[PDB]
Design a protein around this ligand. Structure first.
Ligand SMILES: [Zn+2]
Lengths: 101, 215, 118, 154, 128, 84, 60
RNA sequence: UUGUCUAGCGAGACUGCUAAUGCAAAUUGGAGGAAGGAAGGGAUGACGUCAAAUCAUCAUGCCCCUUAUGUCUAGGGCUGCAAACGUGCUACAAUGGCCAAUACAAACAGUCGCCAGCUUGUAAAAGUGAGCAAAUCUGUAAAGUUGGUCUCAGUUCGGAUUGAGGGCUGCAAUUCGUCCUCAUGAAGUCGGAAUCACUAGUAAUCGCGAAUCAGCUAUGUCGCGGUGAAUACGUUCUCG
RNA sequence: GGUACACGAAAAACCUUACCUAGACUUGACAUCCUUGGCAAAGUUAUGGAAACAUAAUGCCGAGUGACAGGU
């Protein structure tokens, strides 16, 4: 082993893409590695930005966009160093940004 | 006054055009203002390539610009003389430490993309072609390709003053009100000799039932 | 120097009626001179008044605050100073808007006719 | 125009067992705070047991019965110098207006503290004095004076 | 014999536990009394009005934990949890609980503050 | 108030005023920094402070201590309201 | 006088408080978003274009 | 005194069934049910009108300037002042003033920042110094309850104005910032013709968060939750 | 006018800033093309100045040339 508690945390601005990535990781880790509790939903940090529509005053009609940022979490009980060797080839997409322990 | 038909379905029926992230608001602004420059360079400098759109993909000092153009060879050039040139402007506008690895791929049935058709409208109008017959030829050639209804309208100086003489064209089912519609939208500025001509094209490209989410 | 301290009320705020004693230093003197709250002005032993007078004399003389305010005003006015210049015209000095507001010091109102709109 | 509007329901208070008491506590409420008006009204209740020892429910219903107005006034004009028209109003709005009069007249008096002024208001309403019965009597006296208009109206 | 439930009125959750005990029920909410937690109003009376149309605190313990909202939302959540708990204890209570409209999650919640409107409904003012 | 070396000057105006004060104390010297406060040494000279158009002279006196240099120079005129 | 404002905004300022925020593409010195370095109307046009990675329509 | 909870999927509600009346859409009633007859809300706004607004986002033809209407720099002015209007805030007091104990959110944000706890400081704050890239750590909810004082009056309401002493950012606070403490306490005891908002978790009202930004009497704006109403009989008039 | 008046502006002590006064500058603060190259670019410290700045020195950048650049 020599590396217990691989606490990988994945965060993205999309849900179905992050769900696909976590499904792929849970299926690939379902091989050599064991004792991996399932995906951990997180409160999906959210913000709203509001912008006036017209180039001129027209204040009474303004719209607003929203940059959603979904969040999940994984914990790995032990490395099983061959498992990280298999892990080296995952090539996750750019939309999901990783953060391990 | 109505909303841009692209934005309403964008992010829930259409995948984003530039997927990337960086350190929180430190230089994400820099990356956006940089890759929009690449996008503008593609849509501006090379009219002859009819680039439909560009995909920007950055992750921590790497970039890959997928392109979809009707005619790839003009971007490629003769014996690859133009690809190296265009990639060196991309480099000098992006820096030097970042790999580029551009790719160019022809787009199947390009004539169903509003971008290239609007560009053709701009080229025709700027060339003093009578606007009505150009509209009709472009409309027929687009519709014959097997698509659904079209909406092309043009404002600006229609060969003279009193611009409130604007022509609009609608030729079938194109439901803005339906979110699950798979509609395309574009816009070009046909810089005529008398001012600015804005051409707008709406393309209905079939039903998008059972999509679930973005592609 | 006992200036109109009425009865049927507590001494803590009775001390305030002289010119220059807010409630803050009123409670300060209240605690300094062992005076106990919830005791009306009436039924007050003579012993506390002398201590109150002494501690007040230790502080700034209540009638002399007007003296000092006038002294500061004339001291800043005698030198040509924009703050004094503004203070003379009975208009606020602390930078408040003068376009329409700041009428608590200029007087109630003096209306004047505007343009002949037509 | 519009159609008929359904009414939201009001639940009786299961301690004194009267929904009219609930409408009391609702109307006398300000700022949207049931607690403060609740304490005020219950202190008024305790005062009802305190002086003039009698069932608070009985004096309550007596006040309601005395303050209630028999007829209402409705405006139907033709030209300048408009003319009133007295029409019939159902009991729900009658008791609503009685409660409104009690509430408004209570906060119009001497005896600054709310407890005693509202208690005196309910006492006077039970005893038929000029506090609120005067207003009801006046509004009744304008009625049936021009009842010719009431008979032929729409 | 524990009996369960759940209430979610106005952003306020409420988990309940009910057991038929020796006493009248020994009301205990959040391990403390309702009298000092909830000010003595009709709000404390609201929880036993489900019981009034039933065996009114004959033998039914109260073990409730509360989170979220203010106190009125807490009261609604715990009331709905109680009515669900009686329904779980006895199906025969649907006809009398639903007739009085005690269940069904009134779902009256503060709306979203719409732009251009001060409190999502008030316009600033009108001027000509 | 600065609360730490409260008497504040642009720190470039010190050298010339100190020089002149030890150089027979010439009165007319052109200054633009309405930013500065006066040290106790300042008393004695005149300065052609700039308001925004031209230079107006101010004579410093020991009568006042601590007040800002530029406050002596009004910048905005009076009402001068016409009838209508 | 706009292009000179462009070049002045870029230069290193003599003072920490001298400089201010501004959109890169255009010189509108108002309503610029520090989280995107892009003007509010510029942000709207690029978001309808969709260059920003995460943009939706608010339903919230 | 645990399955709350969060976020993914699925179910659920589709006039589904029954009653009536109608050709049929459909209408109403009932049962079931969390919700029943467009469930609450948002996003979404046709052809066009007002030569509506924006050449000062941007692009933009034409015209004009060019050792200047262009470039940099210091100061000022965008904050004035006889006056009037508009939108807000505090109120004009015992439903309240003040003091002590006192518990109850949600959402959002934060490693040049949030700032825990501690020390000094009547205080603005200053210092020490963790934890926190964050459901962990931090950003004390206020209303509310209990107790007490106040006892109806230009006041123990009200806070302007003004004077002084402190604090913070910032090179720097006089035009031209802001906070704290001390000092005084304008006027106002509900307001003329006339008007505005609102059909429920709404009004009112209590607070809380964010943005631009080092600083900002933003009382503004954009958002979150706490407490928490009346009435719609009816369309004769009024507005469109 | 409704559809303007806590509006542009989601923040003017300097900048912002577009105005005024004053100081200074002119293929220019900034861009390309023509010709010619390869080491300084910024920032730092004296110096007069209020500061642009002229200085003297440390550590992609230059020099001559018109279309012109530029105009809130
Ligand atoms: Zn911009």
């Amino acid at each position: 082993v020599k590396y217990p508690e691989l606490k990988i945390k994945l965060e993205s601005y999309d849900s179905t893409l992050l769900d696909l990535t976590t499904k792929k990781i849970v299926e690939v880790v379902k091989g050599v590695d064991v004792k991996i509790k399932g995906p951990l939903p997180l409160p999906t940090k959210k913000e709203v930005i509001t912008i006036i529509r017209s180039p001129h005053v027209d204040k009474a009609s303004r719209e607003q966009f929203e940059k959603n940022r979904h969040k999940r979490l994984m914990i790995l009980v032990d490395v099983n160093q061959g498992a990280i060797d298999s892990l080296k080839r995952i090539k996750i997409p750019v939309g999901v940004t990783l953060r391990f322990s | 006054q109505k909303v841009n038909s692209n934005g309403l379905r964008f992010g829930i029926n259409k995948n984003w055009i530039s997927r990337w992230t960086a350190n929180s608001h430190a230089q994400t602004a820099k990356w956006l203002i940089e890759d929009e420059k690449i996008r503008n360079l593609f849509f501006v400098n090379y009219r002859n390539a009819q680039v439909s759109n560009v995909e920007i993909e950055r992750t921590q000092a790497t970039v890959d610009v997928f392109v979809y153009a009707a005619q790839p060879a003009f971007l490629i050039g003769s014996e690859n003389k133009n690809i190296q040139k265009i990639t060196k402007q991309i480099k000098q506008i992006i820096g030097r430490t970042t790999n580029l690895d551009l790719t160019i791929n022809e787009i199947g049935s390009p004539m169903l993309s509003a971008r290239i058709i609007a560009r053709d409208l701009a080229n025709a109008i700027e060339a003093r072609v009578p606007l009505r017959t150009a509209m009709r030829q472009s409309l027929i050639k687009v519709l014959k390709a097997g698509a659904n209804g079209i909406k092309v309208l043009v404002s600006g100086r229609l060969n003279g003053a009193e611009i409130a003489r604007d022509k609009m064209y609608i030729e079938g089912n194109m439901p803005l009100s339906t979110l699950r519609a798979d509609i395309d939208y574009a816009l070009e500025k046909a810089q005529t000799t008398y001012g600015v001509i804005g051409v707008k094209v709406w393309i209905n490209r079939g039903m998008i039932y059972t999509k679930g989410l973005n592609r | 120097l006992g200036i109109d301290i009425p009865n049927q009320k507590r001494i803590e705020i009775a001390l305030t009626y002289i010119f220059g004693i807010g409630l803050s230093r009123s409670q300060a003197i209240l605690k300094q001179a062992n005076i106990n709250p919830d005791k009306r002005v009436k039924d007050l032993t003579e012993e506390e008044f002398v201590a109150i007078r002494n501690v007040a004399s230790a502080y700034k003389i209540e009638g002399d605050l007007r003296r000092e305010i006038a002294l500061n005003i004339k001291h800043l006015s005698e030198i040509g100073a924009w703050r004094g210049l503004r203070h003379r015209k009975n208009l606020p000095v602390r930078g408040q808007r003068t376009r329409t507001n700041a009428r608590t010091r200029k007087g109630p109102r003096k209306t004047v006719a505007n343009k002949k709109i037509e | 125009r519009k159609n008929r509007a359904p009414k939201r329901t009001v639940l009786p208070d299961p301690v004194f067992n009267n929904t009219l008491v609930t409408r009391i506590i609702n109307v006398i409420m300000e700022d949207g705070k049931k607690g403060l008006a609740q304490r005020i009204l219950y202190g008024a209740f305790d005062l009802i047991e305190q002086r003039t020892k009698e069932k608070p429910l009985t004096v309550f219903e007596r006040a309601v019965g005395n303050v209630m107005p028999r007829l209402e006034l409705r405006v139907r004009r033709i030209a300048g110098s408009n003319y009133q028209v007295p029409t019939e109003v159902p009991q729900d709005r009658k008791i609503a207006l009685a409660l409104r009069w009690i509430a408004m007249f209570a906060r119009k008096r001497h005896e600054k503290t709310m407890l005693e002024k509202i208690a005196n208001e309910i006492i006077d309403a039970s005893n038929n004095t000029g506090a609120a019965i005067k207003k009801k009597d006046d509004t009744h006296k304008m009625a049936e004076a021009n009842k010719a208009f009431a008979h032929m109206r729409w | 014999q524990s009996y369960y439930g759940l209430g979610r009125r106005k952003s306020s959750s409420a988990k309940v536990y009910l057991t038929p005990t020796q006493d009248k029920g020994k009301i205990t909410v959040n391990r403390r009394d309702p009298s000092e937690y909830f000010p003595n109003k009709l709000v404390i009376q609201d929880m036993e009005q489900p019981l009034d149309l039933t065996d009114l605190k004959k033998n039914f313990d109260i073990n409730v934990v509360v989170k979220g909202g203010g106190f009125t939302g807490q009261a609604g959540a715990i009331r709905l949890g109680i009515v669900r708990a009686l329904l779980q204890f006895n199906p025969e209570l649907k006809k009398i609980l639903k007739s009085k409209k005690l269940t069904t999650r009134d779902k009256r919640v503060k709306e979203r503050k719409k732009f251009g409107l001060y409190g999502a409904r008030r316009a600033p003012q009108f001027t000509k | 108030r600065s609360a730490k070396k409260g008497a504040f000057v642009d720190a470039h105006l010190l050298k010339k005023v100190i020089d002149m004060n030890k150089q027979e104390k010439k009165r007319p010297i052109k200054t633009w920094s309405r930013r500065s406060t006066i040290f106790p040494e300042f008393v004695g000279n005149t300065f052609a402070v700039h308001n925004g158009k031209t230079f107006i002279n101010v004579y410093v006196t020991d009568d006042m201590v601590g007040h800002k240099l530029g406050e002596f120079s009004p910048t905005r005129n009076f009402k001068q309201h016409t009838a209508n | 006088a706009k292009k000179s404002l462009k070049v002045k905004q870029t230069r290193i300022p003599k003072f920490a408080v001298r400089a201010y925020t501004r959109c890169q593409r255009c010189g509108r010195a108002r309503a610029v978003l520090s989280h995107f370095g892009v003007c509010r109307l510029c942000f709207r046009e690029l978001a309808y274009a969709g260059a920003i990675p995460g943009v939706k329509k608010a339903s919230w």
